[PDB]
Enzyme design. Structure first.
Site, short mmCIF file in Angstrom:
data_model
loop_
_atom_site.label_atom_id
_atom_site.label_comp_id
_atom_site.label_asym_id
_atom_site.label_seq_id
_atom_site.Cartn_x
_atom_site.Cartn_y
_atom_site.Cartn_z
N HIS A 41 0.81 -1.22 0.00
CA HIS A 41 0.00 0.00 0.00
C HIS A 41 0.85 1.28 0.00
O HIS A 41 0.27 2.36 -0.14
CB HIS A 41 -1.09 0.02 1.09
N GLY A 143 2.23 5.81 10.45
CA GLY A 143 3.66 5.84 10.16
C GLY A 143 4.36 4.54 10.54
O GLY A 143 5.49 4.28 10.10
N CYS A 145 3.47 1.40 9.64
CA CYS A 145 3.37 0.28 8.68
C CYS A 145 4.76 -0.14 8.20
O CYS A 145 5.64 0.71 8.04
CB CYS A 145 2.45 0.63 7.51
C1 LIG Z 1 -2.51 3.84 5.54
C2 LIG Z 1 -2.73 2.86 6.70
C3 LIG Z 1 -2.19 3.37 8.03
N1 LIG Z 1 -2.97 2.61 9.02
C4 LIG Z 1 -2.59 2.55 10.41
C5 LIG Z 1 -1.85 1.49 10.91
N2 LIG Z 1 -1.53 1.30 12.20
C6 LIG Z 1 -1.95 2.21 13.07
C7 LIG Z 1 -2.70 3.36 12.72
C8 LIG Z 1 -3.13 4.32 13.67
C9 LIG Z 1 -3.86 5.40 13.27
C10 LIG Z 1 -4.18 5.60 11.93
C11 LIG Z 1 -3.78 4.70 10.99
C12 LIG Z 1 -3.03 3.54 11.34
C13 LIG Z 1 -4.07 2.02 8.48
O1 LIG Z 1 -4.83 1.28 9.07
C14 LIG Z 1 -4.20 2.48 7.03
C15 LIG Z 1 -5.11 3.73 7.02
N3 LIG Z 1 -6.49 3.31 7.34
S1 LIG Z 1 -7.40 4.06 8.46
O2 LIG Z 1 -6.78 5.31 8.74
O3 LIG Z 1 -8.75 4.04 7.98
C16 LIG Z 1 -7.29 3.02 9.91
C17 LIG Z 1 -7.95 3.31 11.25
C18 LIG Z 1 -9.13 2.45 11.49
N4 LIG Z 1 -10.01 1.75 11.67
C19 LIG Z 1 -7.96 4.71 11.83
C20 LIG Z 1 -7.14 3.66 12.48
C21 LIG Z 1 -7.09 2.49 6.28
C22 LIG Z 1 -6.19 1.32 5.94
C23 LIG Z 1 -6.74 0.22 5.29
C24 LIG Z 1 -5.95 -0.84 4.87
C25 LIG Z 1 -4.60 -0.78 5.10
CL1 LIG Z 1 -3.60 -2.11 4.60
C26 LIG Z 1 -4.01 0.29 5.75
C27 LIG Z 1 -4.81 1.34 6.21
#
Ligand SMILES: C[C@H]1CN(c2cncc3ccccc23)C(=O)[C@@]12CN(S(=O)(=O)CC1(C#N)CC1)Cc1ccc(Cl)cc12
Ligand SMILES: C[C@H]1CN(c2cncc3ccccc23)C(=O)[C@@]12CN(S(=O)(=O)CC1(C#N)CC1)Cc1ccc(Cl)cc12
Ligand SMILES: [Cl-]
Lengths: 305, 306
Positions: A41, A143, A145
Site C-alpha cells: 500500500h 507511520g 506500517c
Molecule cells: C494507511 C494505513 C495506516 N494505518 C494505520 C496502521 N496502524 C496504526 C494506525 C493508527 C492510526 C491511523 C492509521 C493507522 C491504516 O490502518 C491504514 C489507514 N487506514 S485508516 O486510517 O482508515 C485506519 C484506522 C481504522 N479503523 C484509523 C485507524 C485504512 C487502511 C486500510 C488498509 C490498510 Cl492495509 C491500511 C490502512
C-alpha cells in the site's frame, strides 16, 4: 525470580530497518541482503486506498519512483516486484548487517516481539500474541506500517509479521513476510472488523505453571478433570478448546512443577467458575494468555541469543 | 492506538555486553570504550558474601586473574580498580560498538529498559520502574548479575542500573554505573529486606491520561479535590504523596486531554474507593504505575480520540 512480558533483544532487526517513500506516502521497510520488503500500500494515495488495483498502480511506477533511505544513506532501487501484499524492492547495496534469518508463518496463540518503527527508525520493542481472531493487540500509530514481528532461536531471526493496518476497535492486522494476511483482511480502506475473540487456554495454563514456579500456589486444589469435561466448561467462558497436542506441549512445565496438566485444568475450571476472590496471580487480577509454554520455559531457564 | 509496556530497542546495549570470570564465579560486564564495568562481588566465594572484605579480596588478585570474553574473543585485562560496588577492568581493546552514552542516577518512580543477560549473552528485554522502596520488580535468575538498565532518549544511551542481587521477597536490587546502590542495600548477604512498597501515584495518573487519549473516559467524575485532601486519601491506600512537582510534570497530558490534574486526582480517589466494577482500563484490571508521564507522551498519539 520474577515474571515479565519479555521481548527478544532487537539489535539484529534494528540493523534491517529502512524508510521507503513513494510520492507523498512514507513507511518502513525491512532490508535483508539486496532486497527491501514493505507493505504494497506504499504505492497508494489516500484516494487509491478506497479501491486499489495494485497491478495497475505498480505498472505505472519506475524504480526511481521509490526512495529508500537507510540511516542517512540513499539506497538506489534497481528492480521491483509484488508478492501477495508485500512489495520487494531490489536495491544496489546488500545490507552488511543482514542476520541469519527465515520467514515463518505463525499460528494463533503464538507470541512474537514487535519492533515499532517510524520513518525507518526503531522506537520501541514489545511482546504480543497472534489472537485466535488473527488480530494483534499492538501499539501502533500512523507511520508504523512496515514494522515487523519476530522470534529468535540461537543466532537466527524468524520474521513472522509485517504491520499493515489498524481496525476500528484499535487492534492491528498484518501479513507474514510473504505478504499473506493473518485473518480475513484485505489491504483496502473498506468496512473491516475484528471478529469475536477467545482466550488462548494453553497459554493461560502455561502462565499458571509460571505462577507455581514463582511461588504462587493458592489456586491449586485436590481435584482433577477429564479433557472433555474441562472443554465443556472452557467453551462456556469463551476459551479456546484444549487439545491433546496442548496437553503434550505442557509436558515439560508439568514435569518441572510436579503438577499434571489435567490437575492444573481443574484449578483453571475453579478460577473460571468462581474468580480470584480479591487475589492476584503474578501481580495480575486477570488470567494472562499471551505467554506460551515455550515463553515460560525460556524465561524460567535463561536461554540466550 | 494501543498501549503496551514498551522497552527501548536494545541493539546499542547488546554490543556492550561481555562475560567476566574470576575463578569459578562468572557474571556479565558492560564494555564501554576500554573499560569493562561489573559487580564487585565477582571476586567473592559464597562464604565471602556473609562479611566480604573487598579491599583484602582484591589486593590478592592480578589483572590476569580476570577473564573477559566478548563474543568468542578474549579481551586482555591491563588494569583494575574498584569504585564503590563496581569493579572497573581496563582492557587492551576499546569497544568499536560503543554507543554515545551517559551514566545517570535515577529517582524512584522513573522507568528504564532492562537487557537481561547470562554469560555475556542477551536473553530478553523488558521495561521496569525504580520502586519507591528502591527495589525493581525484575525477572532475573542466577547468572544475570551485571545486566543493565537504560533509557535511549534520542541516539544517546543513559545507563542507570546494574543488577547485583535478589532480595527474599523476589524483588531486585542494584547500583547506578558509579557503583552506588539504590536504596539502603549492601553487596553483602545480611538480613536485608525491601521496605514496605507504595504505588507511584504520578505514574497511575499518567496512565489514566493515556486511557483518555486512547478514547476512554468511563472513570471520570464531576468532582475535584485539593492536593492535601487527595494526599490524605492516597496514603490510606499506600499510594505515594503527590507533590506540586508531580502536578507540573502532568501539565502537557492535562492540556492534551482538557482534564485538570486535580480533576484526574478526583477520578483516582473514586477508582480507589469503587474498583473497576468488571471494567478494564487499557486492558488492565489493576491501576498500572510503571508508565511515567514521559513514557505516555513517548508512546501515545499527540491527538486525543475525543
Ligand atoms: C494507511 C494505513 C495506516 N494505518 C494505520 C496502521 N496502524 C496504526 C494506525 C493508527 C492510526 C491511523 C492509521 C493507522 C491504516 O490502518 C491504514 C489507514 N487506514 S485508516 O486510517 O482508515 C485506519 C484506522 C481504522 N479503523 C484509523 C485507524 C485504512 C487502511 C486500510 C488498509 C490498510 Cl492495509 C491500511 C490502512
Ligand atoms: C551472587 C548473587 C547472585 N544473586 C542473584 C541475583 N539476581 C537474581 C538471582 C536469582 C536467584 C538466585 C540469586 C540471584 C544474589 O542475590 C547474590 C546471591 N545471594 S542469594 O543467593 O542469597 C539471593 C536469593 C535471596 N534472597 C536467593 C535469591 C546473596 C547475595 C547478596 C548480595 C549480593 Cl550483591 C548478591 C547476592
Ligand atoms: Cl530520574
Amino acid at each position: 525470580s520474577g515474571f515479565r512480558k519479555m521481548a527478544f533483544p532487537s539489535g539484529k532487526v534494528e540493523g534491517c530497518m529502512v524508510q521507503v517513500t513513494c510520492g507523498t506516502t512514507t513507511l518502513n521497510g525491512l532490508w535483508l541482503d539486496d532486497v527491501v520488503y514493505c507493505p504494497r500500500h506504499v504505492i497508494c494515495t489516500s484516494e487509491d486506498m478506497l479501491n486499489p488495483n495494485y497491478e495497475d498502480l505498480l505498472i505505472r511506477k519506475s524504480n526511481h519512483n521509490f526512495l529508500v533511505q537507510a540511516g542517512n544513506v540513499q539506497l538506489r532501487v534497481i528492480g521491483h516486484s509484488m508478492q501477495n501484499c508485500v512489495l520487494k524492492l531490489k536495491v544496489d547495496t546488500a545490507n552488511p548487517k543482514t542476520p541469519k534469518y527465515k520467514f515463518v508463518r505463525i499460528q494463533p496463540g503464538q507470541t512474537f516481539s514487535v519492533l515499532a518503527c517510524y520513518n525507518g527508525s526503531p522506537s520501541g520493542v514489545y511482546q504480543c500474541a497472534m489472537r485466535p481472531n488473527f488480530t494483534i493487540k499492538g501499539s501502533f500509530l500512523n507511520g508504523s506500517c512496515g514494522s515487523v514481528g519476530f522470534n529468535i532461536d540461537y543466532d537466527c531471526v524468524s520474521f513472522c509479521y509485517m504491520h499493515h493496518m489498524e481496525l476500528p476497535t484499535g487492534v492491528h492486522a498484518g501479513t507474514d513476510l510473504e505478504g499473506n494476511f493473518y485473518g480475513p483482511f484485505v489491504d483496502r480502506q473498506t468496512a473491516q472488523a475484528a471478529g469475536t475473540d477467545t482466550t488462548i487456554t494453553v497459554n493461560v495454563l502455561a502462565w499458571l505453571y509460571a505462577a507455581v514456579i514463582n511461588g504462587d500456589r493458592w489456586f491449586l486444589n485436590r481435584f482433577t478433570t477429564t479433557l472433555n469435561d474441562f472443554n465443556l466448561v472452557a467453551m462456556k467462558y469463551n476459551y479456546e478448546p484444549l487439545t491433546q497436542d496442548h496437553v503434550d506441549i505442557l509436558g515439560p512445565l508439568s514435569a518441572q512443577t510436579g503438577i499434571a496438566v489435567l490437575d492444573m485444568c481443574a484449578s483453571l475450571k475453579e478460577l473460571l467458575q468462581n474468580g480470584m476472590n480479591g487475589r492476584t496471580i503474578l501481580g495480575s487480577a486477570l488470567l494472562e494468555d499471551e505467554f506460551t509454554p515455550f515463553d515460560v520455559v525460556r524465561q524460567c531457564s535463561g536461554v540466550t541469543f
